[PDB]
């Protein structure tokens, strides 16, 4: 697994550990989506929400998928590609999650659902890319959704990942 895959895994671990020492709320106050327009120029917040996890099974399950799919994008399409997928999906899934239910949310599953959508579409339309998602997993992904949690994140991420894959799958 490449550098981008790894950097993100260490960022999420580092942040998780801080949340255990300082407590969730303390880290949330600084890394969450702006709760107050006054804070709108604290630019990190549109990304840093993705780095916070709230339970062990939350971090594990997300980093799992991220290691699997992230690594495959980074291996097959390079580090720049995965950066862009990450940044766009984090920001957009954040934007929509905030609208649904306000700013108190976190987790990499926005990014994860974008990656899920990207790998699957791109593998259907462009088998040349060398990436694909088994239909067994696209069914598990769809079960996660209907079981929903940042619902706005999941669905906004997915959208983003399909869009980018389509764009990339013509060229």
């Amino acid at each position: 697994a490449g550098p981008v895959t790894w950097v993100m895994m260490i960022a999420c671990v580092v942040v998780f550990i801080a949340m255990q020492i300082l407590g969730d709320q303390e880290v949330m106050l600084w890394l969450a989506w702006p709760f107050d327009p006054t804070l709108k120029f604290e630019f990190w917040r549109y990304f840093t929400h993705a780095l916070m996890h709230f339970s062990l099974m939350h971090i594990l399950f997300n980093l799992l998928w991220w290691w699997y799919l992230g690594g495959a994008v980074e291996k097959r399409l390079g580090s720049g590609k995965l950066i862009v997928i990450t940044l766009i999906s984090a920001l957009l899934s954040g934007y929509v999650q905030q609208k649904f239910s306000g700013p108190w949310f976190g987790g990499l599953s926005g990014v994860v659902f974008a990656l899920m959508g990207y790998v699957w579409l791109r593998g259907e339309r462009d088998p040349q890319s060398g990436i694909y998602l088994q239909r067994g997993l696209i069914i598990f992904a769809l079960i996660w959704i209907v079981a929903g949690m940042a619902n706005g994140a999941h669905i906004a991420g997915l959208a983003v990942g399909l869009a980018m894959a389509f764009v990339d799958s013509l060229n």
């Binding site: 969730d24 949330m28 929400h49 993705a50 996890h53 709230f54 339970s55 939350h58 899934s93 999650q97 239910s101 108190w104 949310f105 976190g106 987790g107 990499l108 599953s109 926005g110 949690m149 940042a150 619902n151 994140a153 999941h154 991420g157």
Partner: peptide
Amino acid sequence: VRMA
């Protein structure tokens, strides 16, 4: 808090 919601999980994403």
